[PDB]
Design a protein around this ligand. Sequence first.
Ligand SMILES: *C(=O)/C=C/c1ccc(O)cc1
Length: 125
Amino acid sequence: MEHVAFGSEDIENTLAKMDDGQLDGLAFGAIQLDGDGNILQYNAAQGDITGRDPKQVIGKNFFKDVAPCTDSPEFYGKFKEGVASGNLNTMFEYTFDYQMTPTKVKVHMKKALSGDSYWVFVKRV
Ligand SMILES: *C(=O)/C=C/c1ccc(O)cc1
C-alpha cells in the first residue's frame, strides 16, 4: 500500500502526487472537498468505514446530501471558517450515525495544496 501516516505534518504535499488509484492505497479514509463541500475524491478505505460506494458519492455535497450528521458547528462550522479564512488544520473525534451503525472516528481536516480544495481524513478510534 501507500505508506503515509494519519496526521503527518506534510500530508498535503505527499497526497498532491496521488491519483484516485493511489489514494485507494492509504491506510485511512480520505475525502477531497471543494470549498462548497462537494466531493471530488473519496477513497476505498473511507468506503470501508462508512459503507458508501466511492464512485457514487463523487459530485454529491458532503454536508447537505451525504453526511447530515456533520452539519453542525462542531464539523461543518469548522470547515466553513477554514474555507473563508483560507487556512484549516484541525483534528477531533466525531460519531458518524446517519443510516449506519454509529461509528466513532478521528477526523483531520486540512487545506490541500490546490487552491480551492480541502482534505477530510478519517480513521477508526
Ligand atoms: C453523518 O451523517 C455522517 C455520515 C457520513 C460521514 C462520512 C462519510 O464518508 C459518509 C457519511
